[PDB]
Amino acid sequence: FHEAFIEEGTFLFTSESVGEGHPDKICDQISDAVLDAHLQQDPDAKVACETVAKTGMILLAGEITSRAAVDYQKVVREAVKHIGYDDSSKGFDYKTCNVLVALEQQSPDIAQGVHLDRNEEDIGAGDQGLMFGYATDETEECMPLTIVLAHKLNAKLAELRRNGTLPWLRPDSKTQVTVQYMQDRGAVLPIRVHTIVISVQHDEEVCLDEMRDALKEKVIKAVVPAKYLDEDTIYHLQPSGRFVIGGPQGDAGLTGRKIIVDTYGGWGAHGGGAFSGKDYTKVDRSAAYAARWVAKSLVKGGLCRRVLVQVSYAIGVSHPLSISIFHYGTSQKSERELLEIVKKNFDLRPGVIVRDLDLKKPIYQRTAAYGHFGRDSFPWEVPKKLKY
Amino acid sequence: EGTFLFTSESVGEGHPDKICDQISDAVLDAHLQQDPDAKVACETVAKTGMILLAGEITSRAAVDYQKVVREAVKHIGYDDSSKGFDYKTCNVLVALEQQSPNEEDIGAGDQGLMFGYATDETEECMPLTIVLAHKLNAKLAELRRNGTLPWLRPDSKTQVTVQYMQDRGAVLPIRVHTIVISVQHDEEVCLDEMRDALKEKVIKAVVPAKYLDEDTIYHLQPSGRFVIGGPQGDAGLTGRKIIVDTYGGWGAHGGGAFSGKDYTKVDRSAAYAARWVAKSLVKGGLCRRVLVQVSYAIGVSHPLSISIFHYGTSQKSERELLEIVKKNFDLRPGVIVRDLDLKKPIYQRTAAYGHFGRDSFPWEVPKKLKY
Ligand SMILES: C[S@@+](CC[C@H](N)C(=O)[O-])C[C@H]1O[C@@H](n2cnc3c(N)ncnc32)[C@H](O)[C@@H]1O
Ligand SMILES: O=c1nc(N2CC[C@@H](F)C2)c2ccc(Cl)cc2n1-c1ccccc1
Ligand SMILES: O=c1nc(N2CC[C@@H](F)C2)c2ccc(Cl)cc2n1-c1ccccc1
Ligand SMILES: [Cl-]
Ligand SMILES: [Mg+2]
């Protein structure tokens, strides 16, 4: 009878992550390197920096109003060097690539409608839109195990690449983790890892069997708790075989094309806005961080085992248009009661979020790989003590 | 008691991200017209005076990219420097790397995850929030093109907050709580005239009167000035409206963009198939609302995982729904392409007003289920 109980009582869920050298993630990191360069000189910089990456090319396009003097050639090339593209053998070289800049001022129509001649507390949302925050008690970091493990596998590849223990590794990687879960009254309980995919760019020397052995022994077994790995776990390691061609040569990349990788790995919800290259007046970023803070506060405060928060704005309007709560049936309180607790404890005006989460600080390049949520030393990851 | 709000947004055809989606799918369709087996990964970037095409194409087609891009921008309505953008005079840069070149067993072209969603709250099996948001942008384009509101320009955004009730997981729309409309405009029209027209000629022509009341909140031209717009106002990129393209924040999203990708990209083909599955389950009476996840590995034909969430709206378990899906659908990428007839140049039609909930797409025709 056990097989029948397993089929009925369990389900699969899949999340992916990508490494720093994935071309879409290159763009996110460069966009946030540009944002941080501005904020280091001008904490009030208005930044909307999109990056495009293709064979031999980084293009910056968008809108910046800032008192900073930023050397875009230096910032871009230093970011590409850090990622590890330093030779034509790797498909891309920070020393010799083309960097094109098409950056203008912020629209004066936007500036006058959002922030000009306002106290910072009264600044309007920098756009309309919807944003979600999510938290789950299934991990200590209050994140889905699927996305946590997917990100940590890419971080482990970069670590062993950079310390030279796996020197055949190159910067471009993708990971994907399928977890088999059971539920406890709307809370999800991870049982085992069902399937792992790892695809990583490599040099010309190493054989397919040697790479597959190292990815299991030095990466997967160093990241995934042994209790989640068993004789039935499926490993797709270099599944499409050779991956010498990678980075921007392999595929065009853009800023904001990994927004599900950046958030909850498909769990929770997403309002569609990209984070990278945007200052705190862009609610796509600041209100998603605040909603994460709310969701994590509700779970660590013991009000929910899992929770989703929606918030929405209109351009030029400080107060949110709507706030909504979905507790997945994991609270003794109604969604109406939880929403009252939120409105009693939190103030999701962008001019207040920036103070509560210290969002003028140049920490954004750190967020642009391995996820914006579930990591140490970000203000939105410190739960607020709730009163009600 | 038991009520809640949910918000979705949409953007118009001249929103700079949507310009990019439409151009990327115009390029895809141009290739498929000549070479039905064309491989296309066409990313478009739009900023002041510039359309850039970047990506990878394997095609026998000979495509005039200048003509395809300029005709797409003309149709959207950017035909003069007074509007911030002109198809006649803009820079078109082409960075596309083109190469000369059993179907059921072909491997996925990439790893990834994809979701499909359906809800019985509308006939089109889509959330009311995203349906109304899209229809408000379509009405703007309509009244711009027929000259009844000649001060309108192509760049628009809408946002609709609906107040809902629930019936055992099924969602029941009560009323429109809040509407935002921001639309690019000429320098002659006054703010009072635009706000009056947006309420009377746009909103009241689109939203059923039963959903509007004296408490409905209107944010019309809330920035107060929107003369600068299109790519001049804000850089556009392909695949930066993926939630507008799908369910308006309802259901779920795997992160893959649709526009500029041929039918061999599972980011597109498996999302369309997952929609087809979810819609078939709802129209088949098995659920009131349902979410389907599928995932792939590069070089593997069979999905790595398939998952169902019925929101508590089925008398059947998620396990029984999953068995019905597996008995009725083959979500191998080569089989999806055959079953949904995806080699046809139909993609530019998808690139504004959403990929789902609309007439005459094969993924919107429910499959009759045998179980
Ligand atoms: C507000 S802009 C995003 C922020 C912008 N990149 C910046 O530099 O602050 C995003 C979208 O809003 C719309 N938009 C542009 N200018 C606007 C204005 N003056 N008022 C309202 N909406 C506007 C356009 O559809 C544009 O693509
Ligand atoms: O939150 C979630 N919980 C699932 N659970 C299964 C029953 C209980 F165990 C919970 C679930 C399972 C399958 C899928 Cl395809 C989505 C799910 N989602 C979900 C829902 C909306 C959006 C994103 C993910
Ligand atoms: O499907 C959904 N249903 C809601 N309902 C409220 C109780 C019942 F009426 C249903 C709901 C409400 C608020 C929010 Cl913030 C999300 C919700 N979601 C949802 C969940 C996951 C992802 C995307 C949206
Ligand atoms: Cl936007
Ligand atoms: Mg933009």
CB contact under 8 A, A195 and B305: yes
How many angstroms does the Cα of residue B77 sit away from the middle of ligand 4?
Answer: 19
A244 HSE (CA, 13 A, CB side): 9
Q: Which atom of ligand 2 is nearest to the CA of A188?
A: 9
Q: Output the residue whose Cα is nearest ligand 3's atom 23.
A: B250
Q: Cα(first)–Cα(last) distance of chain B, in Å?
A: 38
What was the experiment behind these coordinates? Answer: X-ray
Q: Domain A2-18+145-246 falls in which CATH fold? A: GMP Synthetase; Chain A, domain 3 (3.30.300)
A247 HSE (CA, 13 A, CB side): 28
Q: How far is CA B132 from CA A191, A260, B129, B139, in A?
A: 41, 25, 6, 10
Minimum distance, in Å, between the CA of residue A17 and any CA atom of chain B? 9
Instruction: Kindly identify which residue of chain B lies nearest to residue A185, measuring between CA atoms.
Output: B312
Tell me the C-alpha distance between A126 and A129, whole Å.
Answer: 10
Active site residue A22: yes
Tell me the C-alpha distance between A287 and A213, whole Å.
Answer: 43
Does CATH place domain A23-119 in 3.30.300.10?
A: yes
CB contact under 8 A, B240 and A274: yes
Query: Is there an atom of ligand 3 within 6 Å of A323 CB?
Result: no
Comparing CA positions, the residue from B276, B277, B269, B267 lying closest to residue B325 is: B277
Query: Which residues of B are known binding-site members for L-methionine?
Result: 56, 99, 234, 265
**Are the C-beta atoms of B230 and B160 separated by less than 8 Å?**
no
SS (H, E, C) chain B: CCCEEEEEEEECCCCHHHHHHHHHHHHHHHHHHHCCCCEEEEEEEEECCEEEEEEEEECCCCCCHHHHHHHHHHHHCCEEHHHCEECCCCEEEEEEEEECCCHHHCCECCCEEEEEEEECCCCCCCCHHHHHHHHHHHHHHHHHHCCCCCCEEEEEEEEEEEEEEEECCEEEEEEEEEEEEEEEECCCCCHHHHHHHHHHHHHHHHCCHHHCCCCCEEEECCCCCCCCCHHHHCCEECCCCCCCCCCCCCCCCCCCCCCCECCCCHHHHHHHHHHHHHHHHHHCCCCCEEEEEEEECECCCCCCEEEEECCCCCCCCHHHHHHHHHHHCCCCHHHHHHHCCCCCCCCHHHHCCCCCCCCCCHHHCCCCCCC
Active site residue A257: yes
Using a CB-CB cut-off of 8 Å, the residues of chain A touching B248 are 130
Question: Annotated catalytic residue: which of A28, A32, A42, A50?
Answer: A50
A366 HSE (CA, 13 A, CB side): 9
3-state secondary structure of A163: coil
**Are the C-beta atoms of A365 and A33 separated by less than 8 Å?**
yes
Tokens found for residue A153: 């596998």
CB-nearest partner of B249 from A52, A130, A315: A130
Task: Catalogue the active-site residues of B.
Answer: 15, 17-18, 43, 56, 157, 226, 234-235, 240-241, 261, 265, 267
Q: What are phi and psi of A90, to 5 degrees?
A: -95, -5
**Are the C-beta atoms of B198 and B221 separated by less than 8 Å?**
yes
CB contact under 8 A, B113 and A14: yes
Phi-psi region of A193 (alpha: psi -120 to 50; beta: other; left: phi over 0): beta
Using a CB-CB cut-off of 8 Å, the residues of chain B touching A151 are none
Q: Sort A274 into a burial class: Cβ within 10 Å, 0-12 / 13-18 / 19+.
A: buried
**Are the C-beta atoms of A164 and A171 separated by less than 8 Å?**
no
**Are the C-beta atoms of A61 and B47 separated by less than 8 Å?**
yes
Question: How would CATH label the architecture of A129-137+259-274+282-381?
Answer: 2-Layer Sandwich (3.30)
Tokens found for residue A287: 């209100």
Minimum distance, in Å, between the CA of residue A280 and any CA atom of chain B? 17
A20 HSE (CA, 13 A, CB side): 25
Active site residue A296: no
Q: Which atom of ligand 1 is nearest to the CA of B16?
A: 27
How many angstroms does the Cα of residue B309 sit away from the middle of ligand 2?
Answer: 5
CB contact under 8 A, B237 and A254: yes
**Are the C-beta atoms of A364 and A32 separated by less than 8 Å?**
yes
Q: How far is CA B259 from CA A240, B75, B238, B267, in A?
A: 24, 18, 7, 10
Instruction: Kindly identify which residue of chain A lies nearest to residue B305, measuring between CA atoms.
Output: A12
3-state secondary structure of A250: helix
Query: Is there an atom of ligand 3 within 6 Å of A324 CB?
Result: yes
Q: What are phi and psi of A297, to 5 degrees?
A: -60, -45
CB contact under 8 A, A324 and B5: yes
Tokens found for residue A343: 């409105």
Which of A60, A104, A105, A107 has most ligand 1 atoms within 8 Å of CB, for mutation? A107
Tokens found for residue B302: 């069979």
Minimum distance, in Å, between the CA of residue A310 and any CA atom of chain B? 8
Tell me the C-alpha distance between A113 and B219, whole Å.
Answer: 13
CB-nearest partner of B113 from A16, A252, A316: A16
CB contact under 8 A, B47 and A61: yes
Residues ≥6 apart with Cβ < 8 Å to A131: A271, A273, A283, A284, A287, A288, A291, A310, A311, A312
Helix axes A23-41, A72-83, angle to 10 degrees: 130
How many angstroms does the Cα of residue B251 sit away from the middle of ligand 2?
Answer: 10
The residue whose two tokens read 């907050």 is B161
Show contacts of B78-81: CB within 8 Å, 24+ apart: B78/B14, B78/B19, B78/B154, B78/B230
Rounded to 5 degrees, what angle do the CA atoms B342, B345, B351 make?
A: 95
Minimum distance, in Å, between the CA of residue A377 and any CA atom of chain B? 26
Ligand closest to A264 (CA) is: 2
Q: What are phi and psi of A258, to 5 degrees?
A: -135, 45
Distance of CA A357 to the CA centre of its chain: 17
Tell me the C-alpha distance between B63 and B40, whole Å.
Answer: 12
Resolution in A: 1.7
Q: Output the residue whose Cα is nearest ligand 2's atom 1.
A: A267
Instruction: Kindly identify which residue of chain A lies nearest to residue B161, measuring between CA atoms.
Output: A322
List beta partners, residue B141: none
Ligand closest to B237 (CA) is: 5
Comparing CA positions, the residue from B260, B54, B21 lying closest to residue A98 is: B54
CB contact under 8 A, B161 and A8: no
CB-nearest partner of B239 from A102, A257, A314: A257
Q: Sort A160 into a burial class: Cβ within 10 Å, 0-12 / 13-18 / 19+.
A: middle
Tell me the C-alpha distance between A250 and A116, whole Å.
Answer: 43
Instruction: Kindly identify which residue of chain A lies nearest to residue B3, measuring between CA atoms.
Output: A336
Active site residue A344: no
Determine which helix (DSSP H) or strand (DSSP E) holds A92, and give its type and residue range: strand A92-93
Tell me the C-alpha distance between B93 and B69, whole Å.
Answer: 10
How many angstroms does the Cα of residue A27 sit away from the middle of ligand 3?
Answer: 32
**Intervals of CATH 3.30.300.10 along chain A:** 2-18+145-246, 23-119, 129-137+259-274+282-381
Tell me the C-alpha distance between A327 and A295, whole Å.
Answer: 10
Distance of CA A267 to the CA centre of its chain: 13
Question: Annotated catalytic residue: which of A93, A251, A340, A347?
Answer: A251
A231 annotated binding-site participant: no
**DSSP-derived pairing of the beta strands A57-65 and A306-313:** unpaired
Using a CB-CB cut-off of 8 Å, the residues of chain A touching B244 are 272
**Are the C-beta atoms of A329 and A185 separated by less than 8 Å?**
yes
Query: Is there an atom of ligand 3 within 6 Å of B4 CB?
Result: yes
Does CATH place domain B4-11+127-228 in 3.30.300.10?
A: yes
Question: Annotated catalytic residue: which of A90, A115, A174, A296?
Answer: A174
